[PDB]
Amino acid sequence: GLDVAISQNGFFRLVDSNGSVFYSRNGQFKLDENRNLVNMQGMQLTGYPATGTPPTIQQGANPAPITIPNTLMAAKSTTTASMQINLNSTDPVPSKTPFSVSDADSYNKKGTVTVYDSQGNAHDMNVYFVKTKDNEWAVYTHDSSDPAATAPTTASTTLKFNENGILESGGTVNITTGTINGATAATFSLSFLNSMQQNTGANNIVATNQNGYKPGDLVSYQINNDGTVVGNYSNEQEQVLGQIVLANFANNEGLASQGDNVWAATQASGVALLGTAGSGNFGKLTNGALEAS
Amino acid sequence: GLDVAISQNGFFRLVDSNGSVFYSRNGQFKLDENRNLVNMQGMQLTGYPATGTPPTIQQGANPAPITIPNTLMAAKSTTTASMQINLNSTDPVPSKTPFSVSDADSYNKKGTVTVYDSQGNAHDMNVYFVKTKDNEWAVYTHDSSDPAATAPTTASTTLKFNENGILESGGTVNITTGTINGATAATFSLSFLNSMQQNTGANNIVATNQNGYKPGDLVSYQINNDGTVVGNYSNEQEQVLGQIVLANFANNEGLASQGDNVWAATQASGVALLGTAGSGNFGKLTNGALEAS
Q1: What GO terms fall under cellular component here (chains A, B)?
Q2: Are A216 and A72 in contact (CB under 8 A)?
């Protein structure tokens, strides 16, 4: 049961099953089976919808019943990843050829970045650096999570460093994962931005990142103090679901009582003028609410 | 990446890693780290294994995952060799005695045949012909590749020719090589079949042969149009590795779609009836494939 209060002026904007619009400062709502937020009389709380991916609020749409779906948040397939490596200029060119993922002396360094496909399976992508000549390093990649993968035989790219050790070419390359449990592979741009070749040191990965994630179950939802409604999911991600609209009238004394501190607009009240908590005419909600699903 | 897809009837027969059997006309295979030919879901193409030495495909075989091992093809120790020589009846009996591999006027002719031991070392076998009297020629042999081998002071055989110059006796003799780098010697039958004594000419070796060879690294592999899978090795030899099986059903409409273009047998389809491309129920593969290692 959500309890949300208006600190200063304004009313929540509600609708009944016929679409007639009403107003109330009562902030007692329960999530019903249709995933709407409803007061004790069944009227639905309204606000701006969220659309797109990532979802965003459309403040120019007509207000409609807020929904808090329990639909899982879809996996996002990785399309970018990065690895920042410091490579040692004094490293040997490996004598053991060819390169093999199972031959630890056929490469100079292995790193790993875990990426995700459209279905949300993890692919632990191993990245191998093989010094070929002064200042140049072949890069192989391999999906270690794919039990039916091919052995890489050809470098994905070659990093070339200038005399000061700054990466001058070969720093971005398109990688495709293996196909796990039928799912279509992730295809992503792998960047080695900020990698350098040190005059001396040991091969070391300083940072990695990637922009995908697994699917998430709804763990909790919340109303922020500006009325934005946000879902929190089990994949450590969030999605905006909508934003509560508030209403003010030129004359509150003209509003028609429906009982149960619900009100209707009249000629005497003027038209409802709409906005959001914490902007323009309206103070923030006193707090908002956070509720486990 | 191999491509042998099927516009005809017959299905390839695949297994998942649990041994469950599936069928598909899709012929897109990759050679994975496990050395199986897999489709995009990681299912393994199956067929008859190769057995024996030389490896062959039997009619009694259970289909199993095709393998294309990267393992070396083993050397074959030589067990036969031949040298066909035309010897000159007017040749002198050498006056310089004794016979010595180092004294070029102590023999009438020298030839060479390179044989192999089971490790694959080459032994350069020198063969010396010394006319002893009318129509008889002593033959000495020596492994020039073994520094510890005793100098030949006794003939390995004596060739005797009849009045027409046809070989009458002494034409077949077992030879044992020396040893190289701690490996066991080769033992082979040396044949002088088709050697002749000409009324007049110069001593001349027309042909040699032997049946051994060095070890070979895998260079390429191929699928022939009858589905036989063959490895090609750097010793200029080949090995059969297996033979892809095809399946047909009494009722294809009865097969259970597994997604993609993969199918499972059912009571409605009947049991799979197996064979090979280019025989019985099945026409040849449209082409086959050839891939470098």
Answers
A1: bacterial-type flagellum; bacterial-type flagellum basal body; bacterial-type flagellum hook; cytosol
A2: yes
